[model samples]
Target chain A: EIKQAVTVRPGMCGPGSLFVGQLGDWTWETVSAQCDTDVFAARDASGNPTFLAFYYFRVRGGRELHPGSLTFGDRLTVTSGCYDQGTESVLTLHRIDRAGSDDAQRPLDLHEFYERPRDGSLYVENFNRWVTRSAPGSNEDLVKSSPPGFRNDGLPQLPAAYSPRAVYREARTAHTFRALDEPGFRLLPDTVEVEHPVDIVRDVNGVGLLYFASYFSMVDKAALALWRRLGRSDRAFLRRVVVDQQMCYLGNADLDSVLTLGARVRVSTETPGEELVDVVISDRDSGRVIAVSTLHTQ
Target chain B: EIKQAVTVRPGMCGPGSLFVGQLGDWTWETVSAQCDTDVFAARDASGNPTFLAFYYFRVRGGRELHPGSLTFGDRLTVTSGCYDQGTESVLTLHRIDRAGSDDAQRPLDLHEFYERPRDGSLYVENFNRWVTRSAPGSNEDLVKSSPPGFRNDGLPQLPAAYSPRAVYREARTAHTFRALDEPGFRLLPDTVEVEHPVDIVRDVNGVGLLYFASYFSMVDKAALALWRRLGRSDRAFLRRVVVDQQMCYLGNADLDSVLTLGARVRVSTETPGEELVDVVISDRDSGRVIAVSTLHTQ
Candidate 1:
């Protein structure tokens, strides 16, 4: 049983937007959700629908991970953003963007999004369409008090931000899958794929795949494991932090999937304070590399 | 209400333990929770828990913003690590090292944590412990199918890891509290405190404050904000990543606090690709710098 459709209006502050479409000195008059395929469409302005903004904090997924909670992609007025446990399904609701052929950008009474009927008895997929983008913003401490329009009073129910509806297409890879004995570079001798204990709390995210940030911890743990095995924890060990990191999420791993990691010195400068390493994590089931991360540590 | 204590066996695995008391290859023969003044005493262990292991991931405090998740500090031995809102608490259990005298070398845990209790019932004010060394490990990916002791066959129910129990004594600060009108360095002419819309999904963590990694995003966001404000998002914006970073967490912030950040170029290498900036974040309410971070971006 689907509940209803909701509509949303773009404003400088409120329920359907991020801080009412205003952050600091920057303001977005319109926002559009852009999928590789097509953006969502908009409908009745005051109807019951889910509203969405690109900025998010904890778990996030869809087209891609927002560059950091700062970048808000296009604004979207989605009808529904629901996920079904029965179907292990990702709820796919539709919304609209600006730049429509109809010059669709308009200021309405309110934006709409259906409150997800999680108690429903039917599979639901609805479509609405349109354009636009506002990456996220960063605030500073020295400035004035609150910038205009950012009032905490009377805040509406925030639109349930959901992972982008997905249909994975154009799957590709840059490096060919390397075999156990065919690694491109020499892995430090003690390097071995350590067991991956799946702690959903730290590793899993709304994205469903391992949260990308978890990779940072993943490389970190592996590096320590390697260091310890080399008899380093007794400590020629360094108080290292990630000064540089690069990760390629080729594929994702689920709770049931078996994943392992390996690490090695990628580069070590004569300067003891600086170091670099490469970490590779592969899902054994897929027989494909899931991610390749290069870290510059100091 | 604080529940009756169910003693935990200082084993290497299973529920009632933090992530099954295991992380990568370095196994913890025993992991004793330590509050700032006193380490929790064990009832069933062979003797005093010989403090083994170092480092942690998840819940972290200090320098403010414990990510988005508002879990608190205090230690615990839980049964079936699960989140229960009904409890209205973050099961505050406590632990420690084998040293009977209690001269614990805590700073070395590199003291990583994952603050997991989502409720507001526990005593959140724990002591701020002092320093020592690093114990976080790093691993590599290559060669063997798996590292030592890590197996997917019997995944243990992971405990929501929490920060070490403590009381904030001898609270201190490094950089003097620069007033709004008396910053140590020149702020960018346009620097203004941006609004911090709490986005637990992306910025919040079990740590309760802003996830440390989120700081990377914060600075990245600020850099990009500055970059874009410079009319640089389109063309002149350079492809950048971190090569150096330094952060000092002086205090922590909660959901009620209002925080904003500002970034200014800290250094410039002769090379066009190199740029360094300082990001200082302070709470409007606390009126003191919560954290100072320097980043080298290229």
Candidate 2:
């Protein structure tokens, strides 16, 4: 039998600050205590409660693993859907028994969750495993159905007038929300918007997006998952949901750790007879290149 | 045959301070008038006059070397004897020859002649050679010749008392009279004499005299020669000489030099006591040692 329930305010759940127990067992205990918000029992693919997100919850008391009463054991497990106030995201178990009891705790590995989205949704099936599973010959058929993923015209592209200045302004506002909500994240000072030239082109998917081409100046970083309830569309929201977007800059050269996108993007004139033009977005905190997009030409 | 008669003043006998002539012949027209005393050429072997001596007596120049008209080359064979005040002795010449024109005006080879009592004869020889020939053979001989040389037995044969309370006395004088009389000698102030005990002994010849076997002491070195002269009577006279002596008291040690019969003596006691005593004396004014003599107690 499947049971589901929600509560406006959920009571405290285990492992409650100082206790230690399995996720399902702890959830059962929380439920017995009348904790009614979808009881999150950290689990594995088999749906069994386990110590998957043990690193997500703070472990306290004692020195060595066995010496501590809160040490992770076979019965120890984290509720899969446990909310983390630190990251403002649902903490899920990534790898279990990593480094065992002797390993130091680290952030959950995110690489396994999703493939990077390429060229919006056009030729999206190229990476869609469900369609390839439903139709055995779908990959080859789909490849013939759309342009190649690496075609010069089929590559993802950036908007010519996509000003990094506007994007920076929006990003700055979004960063303020993160700064206010998160404990240590702070908004960089004097973060002003600037417009710098960047090259853009269409991708094989016929989707318009920031390109990762040699000539393009930026590529969007990984998308951060925001809880749908914590989104702006939620009625419980008194303020807009803040989304942090990161973009790495590339130039006519191949992308490298040291290549800064802002260095390649050139400033664009505003008026036909304008005597001066300056555009370069710099990270106010580190005094480094941040983003690069073109300004409006005369 | 003894016709030339001459009389020579003491200082003018051997080599007078004189200037005669540059004559071409023995003629008044070819000769210049007598201008100075010609002590270099005067009396004959018996101290008789040369032609210039007669000229002096005729001209009544008694206080000088006759008429002083004689040149060094002029032969003055003595026909009569006369005393020389310069040497405090009777002057005579046995073999006389003028010094070469190239010879020094005051040639050291030229010396005053005095008659030896042995035969009442006079001859010119180097002063040092004559002294050595005339001195007694040894300390015994010296004592035997009591009236004219040093004596030995007159004084007590004992270590002379070390009189610390007495004025410090040097064994020799600081004068460089005879040897360094020439301009080439450079004298320094630190040179002086010291004294050490000398053994008193008689030689095989019965000459009662003091023999410095290993060391000896003396005072009034400046007057040592004169002291020796005064001691010609006996050791008693020698004692008297020491008792009346004056010196700078250079302490005591053995000496290198020996006073043999008739040796030309020039005393140098710059390094007093043992310092100078270790040095040796051999020949006329030869500071090098021929034999080493040490001092001992009687």
Candidate 3:
């Protein structure tokens, strides 16, 4: 296991020194630009790593980023690799964690990617182990052969290997990572829908994908907009203050997206000054959910 | 003069202790919240301070702000104050300094304001000696007149002072700050027009005002766009690597601002791999310039 400490600062690709180096003994090479992430490994001198994670900058609400924190997207990619014989590189890409202060939560956590030396080409071959890499030959050939790559990661071989579609389309968490208990975080069926048209401003990097942090802003502004319509307080209460929050990045929501925000505001029953709201952001197209957020405020 | 040293951290308002004390005996007080800025002073116990400074979070670009650096906006308001034989209080609503990043500049330069703490209709009367305080009336009378208040510190000013005019019409050092000699910087009048819509993602502290750092992303993207259009480098060349940059914020633009960017690209004649671009952002509607940025990249 190799080791290197990275300080995730705020904004573009984080505020730390980007490191690009070769693996020990030239077994491989690595580059940690604090961008999107994933990883892999092998035994022979020719071990490998793979990545196909996409990301956008997730900035803090504002104010300089926290004292020593960095702004990172809540995305993660874990790979299980093998290089002994050749066909290798496992890649598991999805959000890592959404814990810590706004900035802290978004900070990069790819300590594993560097260890395995993390992306592309033959990416379609990474099916057996979900982000696992394998299958030699041409690009199209790699995509066709369902050579269950997990036979090497020390895991039970399934009759039918899993595919990226499993981790991506079917469920947000397919790694068997303990499902977070959510008896109440998600928006219940009965919730007021807030209509907000997503703007291009939230585009990630130069691409059109909606930036992650904007979701919080999206969820928050709805609460604020309601507060405004109520003539209650001009204070952008939810916007300026955030006690605790969580977001599940389900799929993509881009520019001019007519977001139907199912914002259900729930003032705490026990704690005064405590506010919790479950915002379900979805494209009005079919009211299909884009993302869900639970914001806690004081 | 009483003094205090502020260690600017992140997250909260700024890194320093927020000061809201009064004109002490002998005269004045001061407080710096590494974020929004203001000050005051006096030789006698009657000295005072004045300010109508409004601000949203102007955090350092996502990274631990450099050592000893305070996060600041390009805006500064300076008030020369006056107070004596008082109504127990003198209210001089005024701007201190919204200058560039040179604290060597905007520093307690407004120190005169505290002397008279000058502003408002009352401002003229307090200007006899720059910093002076007055007005004869009961507490209720003062409060009734307009209720001496400073509750909101984040919104724009009002009817009398609310002028897109001051920022756009008037000027800062307006070159008196020493054109700093353009030598090779600054966009010439012959610059080409680049159309780039302003995204709300650049907003500061949840407000509609643009976040300072967002400009970098903007100008950089436009450069990338031009590079791509010309089939030069799909990669946003000058943007990805910034050697240095400066922006003179003359005005503000909020969401949906169709910006007309005047970008002038210049290759550094002396340094290899060097690129400099002067980007002038203007609201397509008002045709008023929003901000001017000079970015040096490699």
Tell me the tens digit of each residue's lDDT in model 2 across A39-92.
222222333321111111111111121201122111221212221212111222
Give the DockQ of candidate 2. 0.00
Model 2 C-alpha lDDT per residue in residues B106-159, reported as the tens digit of each score: 211122221111111122211000011123322111110111221122221211
DockQ values per model: 0.02, 0.00, 0.03
**lDDT by residue for model 1 (B1-298), tens:** 1122222111111111122121211111111111111121111122222111121112222211111211111123221111121111112222222222133232211122233322211111111111211222211110111112222232222233322212111112322122233323333454334555433333432213343334444544555566666555422332344433444445445534556777666333345555556666677665766656555455
State the fnat of candidate 3 relative to the true structure.
0.00
Sort all candidates by DockQ, best to worst. Answer: 3, 1, 2
After superposition, candidate 3 runs with Cα above 4 Å error: A1-195, A206-208, A232-241, A254-256, B1-202, B205-211, B217-246, B249-290, B294-298
What digit string (tens of lDDT, one per residue) describes model 1 on residues A130-153?
111111111111111211222223
Candidates 1 and 3 compared: the better one by TM-score is 3
Better of 2 and 3 by lDDT: 3
Query: B1-298, model 3: which lDDT tens digit per residue?
Result: 1222222111111111110000111011212111122222111233222221221111111111211122211122233322221222232222222233234132232233224332211111111011222332110111111113322243222333322223323323341111434465443233467777644323331112343345545655565555555566422331244423444555555444577776666565566656566666777687576666555555
Scored by CA lDDT, what does every candidate get?
Answer: 0.32, 0.20, 0.33
RMSD of each: 27.2, 59.3, 17.8
